[PDB]
Structure 1
Amino acid sequence: ATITVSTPIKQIFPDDAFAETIKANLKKKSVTDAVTQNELNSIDQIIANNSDIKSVQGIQYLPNVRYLALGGNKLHDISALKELTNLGWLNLSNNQLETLPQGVFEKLTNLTTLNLSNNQLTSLPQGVFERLASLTTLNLSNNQLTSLPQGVFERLTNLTTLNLSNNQLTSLPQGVFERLTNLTTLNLSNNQLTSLPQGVFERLTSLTTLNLSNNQLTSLPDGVFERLTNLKTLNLSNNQLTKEACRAVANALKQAASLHELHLSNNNIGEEGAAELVEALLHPGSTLETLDLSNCNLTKEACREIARALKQATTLHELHLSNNNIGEEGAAELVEALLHPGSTLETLDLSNCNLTKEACREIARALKQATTLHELHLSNNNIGEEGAAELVEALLHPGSTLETLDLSNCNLTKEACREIARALKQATSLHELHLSNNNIG
């Protein structure tokens, strides 16, 4: 729309905040000042985040706007936006949008970035994104979405980032990502998914990051990650994954030759599941660098198996086994891998692993001699002060190479803490030491 005569700013934009926004944009003394369509046409950019705007009525008189930041306002309605065909960038995050009209974005062919995050969308209309040919980034996170209609993204061929996190999505339609062949980042974390259809990620050949954490996944189709050849990061943590679902993860490991990070913390894979992942890593040519199996209901026997994998999978530099019942026997199995010729592990986390004194004694043997191990977390373990003193006695060997030691919250006394940080000094390679929450948290 357009104005035919010189019109007071505050007649075009009845929202007092937005009027003030337009007044500042054009350097007028007052919102009572008349403006011409030509002046309104001079506006190609509005940055008005957090300006207490309830309504953008009148924005339709600004056809040349290409960059629009309206984040953190109080917008309930955006239908005044639909003829703004020059919009390349649109930020409507943190408003109060509950629904989207069917055709509200059908004219925004130049739109490349769309942020609808932190609203209260409960659902998406069919085809609300059907004409966003140019779109590369769609952020839909922190909404209330409980489903996605079939084909809601089927025309977004240029999409590279799709963020669907922190919604209440309970399933995915099977072809919902069929056309996103250029997508590199897919964030589905913090949803209520309980299953995935076979072939939901099948055409995602460019995908490098797949985040599926904080869902309620149990089993997985064996093939569900197979065509993800370029995948580099898989986060499956905080789910309810079983030993079943490990078959699929194993296949990701075999098929994605440059998968570097596997996050599986907080799951129910058990030792049987771990063994399945182990047999995937026992194959020549793994490139995996970081593995997280914290709180995976692991045992000392899963530790034997994981030790087999550490001996063969020497790209693996960072390993997390926190919150598992590992004990002295499990510690002993891992120390065997630490002292194996060609162990490449740099960082090991064994916090809250039921580690005792006898388990420190086993670990002492690794810390005594030259290894690649530079960072070790034993926090949240009731190691005890003879436990600590064994670690200490091993670290004062001229052989030692550890750099960082974490004993946070290991039920030690100020007396012991000081007596440990004391002898710190002598272990030349070690230049970091965490002792907090022992008796002073």
Structure 2
Amino acid sequence: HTITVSTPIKQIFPDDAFAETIKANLKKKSVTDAVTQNELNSIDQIIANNSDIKSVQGIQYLPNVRYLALGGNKLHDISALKELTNLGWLNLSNNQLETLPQGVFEKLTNLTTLNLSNNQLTSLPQGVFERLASLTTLNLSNNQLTSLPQGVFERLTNLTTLNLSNNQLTSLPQGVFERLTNLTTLNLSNNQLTSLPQGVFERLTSLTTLNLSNNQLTSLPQGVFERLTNLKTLNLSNNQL
């Protein structure tokens, strides 16, 4: 969005903590001070971790923000982020996100890092990451996921780090990692996996670290790790093999 007349920071950003962040960023004396769209356009990063922010309403007016560090707040809604097309790094770790709108990330074509760890996500909508062609890092650890939709990572061809640890996954679709040919780190530890699908890691030729610790695996398929020629670290501890 855009403002056509100078407007008080608190009018645009209703959350007092977030308004304070904007005030500090723009070097203003008070959150009641008026700002211009040109000043809002000058913002390319917001660092506000552990700031008790409940809402980022108003962020829609910052077209140029590229780095958004909002870890450790009280966010439940991130719909205001949808049209921030210049976003490259989004840290939403440790908030109170329970669900993700299906198309909330559809416009973030420049996003390379997405940290959604330590939230309370119970599911991933099909295609929620479909347009994140530039993504290299996806951290979904410490959530409440029980299953992954097939194809949920299929367009993330440039992904190098995928952290799915500390969830409650009880299965893995067979071709769920099929397109991640550049993946170097895959963390599946602390889940409830009892078996691994045949060929589940077949195409991860760049993989160097695979963590499957703290699951409930009783058996490993024959040659399940055979095509991982660059594998350097394989953690299988605390299972039932």
- Shorter-chain TM-score bucket reads over 0.9
C-alpha displacement at 1:219, in angstroms?
A: 1.2
Do residues 14 (structure 1) and 8 (structure 2) align? no
2:32 alignment counterpart = 32
C-alpha displacement at 1:8, in angstroms?
A: 0.7
C-alpha displacement at 1:439, in angstroms?
A: 35
C-alpha displacement at 1:224, in angstroms?
A: 1.3
C-alpha displacement at 1:437, in angstroms?
A: 26
Summarize the Cα distance change of 1:72–1:217 in structure 2 as closer, same or farther, 3 Å threshold.
same
C-alpha displacement at 1:4, in angstroms?
A: 1.3
Q: Distance in 2 between matches of 1:152 and 1:142?
A: 18
C-alpha displacement at 1:66, in angstroms?
A: 0.3
Q: What is the CA deviation profile of residues 207-241 of structure 1, one whole-angstrom value per residue up to 9, with x for unaligned ones?
A: 01100000000012102111111111110xxxxxx
Q: Distance in 1 between matches of 2:88 and 2:139?
A: 15
Summarize the Cα distance change of 1:155–1:438 in structure 2 as closer, same or farther, 3 Å threshold.
closer
| Between structures 1 and 2, the one with greater helix share | 1
Q: Distance in 2 between matches of 1:5 and 1:169?
A: 50
Contact 2:177-2:200 within 8 A present in 1 as well? yes
Q: Distance in 1 between matches of 2:4 and 2:238?
A: 71
Summarize the Cα distance change of 1:61–1:438 in structure 2 as closer, same or farther, 3 Å threshold.
closer
Q: Distance in 2 between matches of 1:166 and 1:153?
A: 18
Contact 2:213-2:239 within 8 A present in 1 as well? no
C-alpha displacement at 1:5, in angstroms?
A: 1.1
Identity score, percent: 99
Q: Distance in 2 between matches of 1:206 and 1:439?
A: 27
Q: Secondary structure at the match of 2:39?
A: helix
1:311 alignment counterpart = none
Q: Give 1:373-392 correspondences, 5 Å limit.
A: none
Q: Distance in 1 between matches of 2:219 and 2:240?
A: 43
Q: Distance in 2 between matches of 1:53 and 1:45?
A: 16
Q: What is the CA deviation profile of residues 76-113 of structure 1, one whole-angstrom value per residue up to 9, with x for unaligned ones?
A: 00000010000111100000000000000111111111
Summarize the Cα distance change of 1:70–1:436 in structure 2 as closer, same or farther, 3 Å threshold.
closer
Do residues 155 (structure 1) and 155 (structure 2) align? yes
Q: What is the CA deviation profile of residues 386-414 of structure 1, one whole-angstrom value per residue up to 9, with x for unaligned ones?
A: xxxxxxxxxxxxxxxxxxxxxxxxxxxxx
Summarize the Cα distance change of 1:196–1:41 in structure 2 as closer, same or farther, 3 Å threshold.
same
Q: Secondary structure at the match of 2:175?
A: coil
Flag structure 2 segments of 5+ consecutive residues without an equivalent. none
Q: Give 1:24-173 correspondences, 5 Å limit.
A: 24-173=24-173
The runs of 4+ residues in structure 1 deviating greater than 4 Å are 435-440
1:183 alignment counterpart = 183
Q: Distance in 2 between matches of 1:28 and 1:97?
A: 31
Q: What is the CA deviation profile of residues 130-156 of structure 1, one whole-angstrom value per residue up to 9, with x for unaligned ones?
A: 111111110110111111000000000
Q: What is the CA deviation profile of residues 15-60 of structure 1, one whole-angstrom value per residue up to 9, with x for unaligned ones?
A: 1110111011101111111111000000001000011000000000
Summarize the Cα distance change of 1:58–1:230 in structure 2 as closer, same or farther, 3 Å threshold.
same
Q: Distance in 2 between matches of 1:68 and 1:46?
A: 5
C-alpha displacement at 1:438, in angstroms?
A: 31
Q: Secondary structure at the match of 1:20?
A: helix
Q: Distance in 1 between matches of 2:9 and 2:58?
A: 9
Q: Give 1:292-441 correspondences, 5 Å limit.
A: none
Structure with higher Rg: it is: 1
Counting matched residue pairs gives 240
Contact 2:216-2:240 within 8 A present in 1 as well? no
The CA RMSD measured in Å over matched residues stands at 4.8
Summarize the Cα distance change of 1:226–1:15 in structure 2 as closer, same or farther, 3 Å threshold.
same
Q: Secondary structure at the match of 1:195?
A: coil
Contact 2:213-2:238 within 8 A present in 1 as well? no
Q: Distance in 1 between matches of 2:136 and 2:237?
A: 45
Q: Distance in 2 between matches of 1:43 and 1:168?
A: 38
Q: Secondary structure at the match of 2:162?
A: strand
Q: Distance in 1 between matches of 2:26 and 2:14?
A: 17
C-alpha displacement at 1:6, in angstroms?
A: 0.9
Summarize the Cα distance change of 1:187–1:438 in structure 2 as closer, same or farther, 3 Å threshold.
closer
